[PDB]
């Protein structure tokens, strides 16, 4: 019952390698270049964190150098990940998840999403975009970009200076690697 | 049909394509 | 082990299978070209090709449609000439009767 199953794959294993052990997990340092992977740990033994959503996958770009591997993430970023971290061979299931579309407002409410009111529809006490008579974006030729309810911009590539500092530190540490 | 006779059809077709893109766009 | 059918290509297997079908349907002992023999061989080829041919392979599908129309012509010949062999082929190969 079980020994027949562990012997049937032993005649499969000797004519097979990493790139078609789909669903199996091993450390990244045991893998090859160009292996398509998902469910990558950030810390060894903590659990999978990185490539988890439906249809997503990552790609190994470099061999373990100084104990770390270079990996291309679904965002297009590349990160150096510790070679002892685990990952699962293949892509995440349900790859047609991102193309299915709803047809009515009730389906959003079934998922637990409540309606969103635009900032321009409010009053100045509610949103920075509020105010004005008739339809109006509550700024002008000497205003600012479109902003959050808390006044922070949300166009033109804005991010907070803390985020810029942290990402610059990460990029500078990864340039020496 | 020579090139000289083809040119009359060429001009008729160009004017018709122009008129159809001007009228039927609206 | 060397002569096992697992070690044979698909074309060799089709050759052996068509020789068997031709043996099954012959009128004389050297008969290989009568209408009912050609109908049985075409039916076997049509059934193999309708399953193995890729959807994008249009050039082979034109030949498969040619096999279909050849089988119609041979069945039409047998329906007016040899009614017994016509009923033999329709019963044994499971084909419909379409005199129209």
């Amino acid at each position: 019952q079980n020994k027949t199953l562990v012997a049937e794959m032993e005649e499969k294993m000797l004519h097979m390698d990493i790139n078609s052990m789909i669903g199996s997990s091993m450390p990244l340092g045991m893998m090859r270049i160009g292996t398509i992977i998902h469910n990558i740990e950030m810390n060894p033994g903590q659990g999978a964190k990185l490539v988890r959503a439906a249809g997503t996958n990552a790609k190994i770009l470099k061999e373990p150098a100084s104990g770390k591997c270079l990996i291309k993430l679904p965002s297009g970023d590349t990160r150096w990940i510790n070679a002892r971290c685990r990952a699962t061979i293949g892509t995440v299931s349900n790859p047609s998840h991102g193309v299915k579309k709803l047809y009515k407002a009730g389906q959003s409410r079934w998922l637990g999403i409540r309606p969103k009111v635009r900032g321009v529809a409010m009053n100045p006490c509610d949103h920075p975009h509020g105010g004005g008579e008739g339809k109006s974006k509550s700024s002008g030729s000497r205003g600012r970009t479109s902003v959050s309810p808390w006044g922070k911009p949300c166009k033109g590539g804005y991010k907070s200076a803390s985020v810029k500092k942290k990402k610059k530190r990460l990029a500078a540490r990864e340039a020496k690697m | 049909d020579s090139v000289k006779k083809k040119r009359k059809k060429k001009m008729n077709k160009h004017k018709y394509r122009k008129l159809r893109k001007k009228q039927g766009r609206k | 082990t060397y002569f096992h059918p697992d070690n044979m290509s698909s074309a060799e297997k089709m050759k052996i299978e068509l020789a068997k079908v031709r043996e099954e349907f012959k009128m004389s002992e050297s008969d290989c070209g009568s209408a009912r023999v050609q109908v049985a061989q075409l039916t076997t080829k049509i059934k193999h090709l309708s399953s193995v041919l890729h959807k994008k392979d249009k050039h082979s599908k034109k030949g498969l449609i040619a096999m279909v129309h050849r089988r119609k012509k041979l069945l039409k010949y047998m329906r007016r000439t040899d009614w017994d062999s016509y009923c033999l082929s329709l019963s044994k190969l499971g084909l419909r009767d379409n005199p129209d």
Partner: protein, 101 residues
């Protein structure tokens, strides 16, 4: 059908690695109900250009040939040799009536 499996090893691979890969392909042929009729070594050959791998560039190689009577699916089932680090090249060809010397 009858096939010739050509195997161009890297020149640094030892006797044991060559035997290991040839025996792994051979046990793969046996498991699919096949016969191995012939195994031969062409020794060290000089290449026409420098074959470049992740190791570097190689101008020599060890040439092996296994002749097998095997399933038609075996060239597809041998695609693990594309990810094999002992190999420079591999090629499966239908067996020809030509004397190779």
């Amino acid at each position: 059908p009858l096939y010739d499996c050509m195997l161009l090893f890297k020149p640094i691979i030892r006797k044991e690695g060559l035997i290991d890969l040839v025996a792994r392909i051979g046990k793969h042929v046996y498991s699919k109900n096949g016969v191995l009729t012939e195994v031969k070594s062409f020794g060290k050959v000089e290449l026409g250009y420098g074959i470049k791998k992740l190791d570097g560039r190689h101008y020599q190689g060890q040439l092996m040939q296994i002749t097998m009577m095997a399933t038609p699916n075996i060239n597809k089932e041998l695609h693990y040799l594309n990810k094999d680090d002992k190999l420079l090249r591999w090629l499966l060809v239908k067996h020809r009536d030509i004397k190779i010397g």
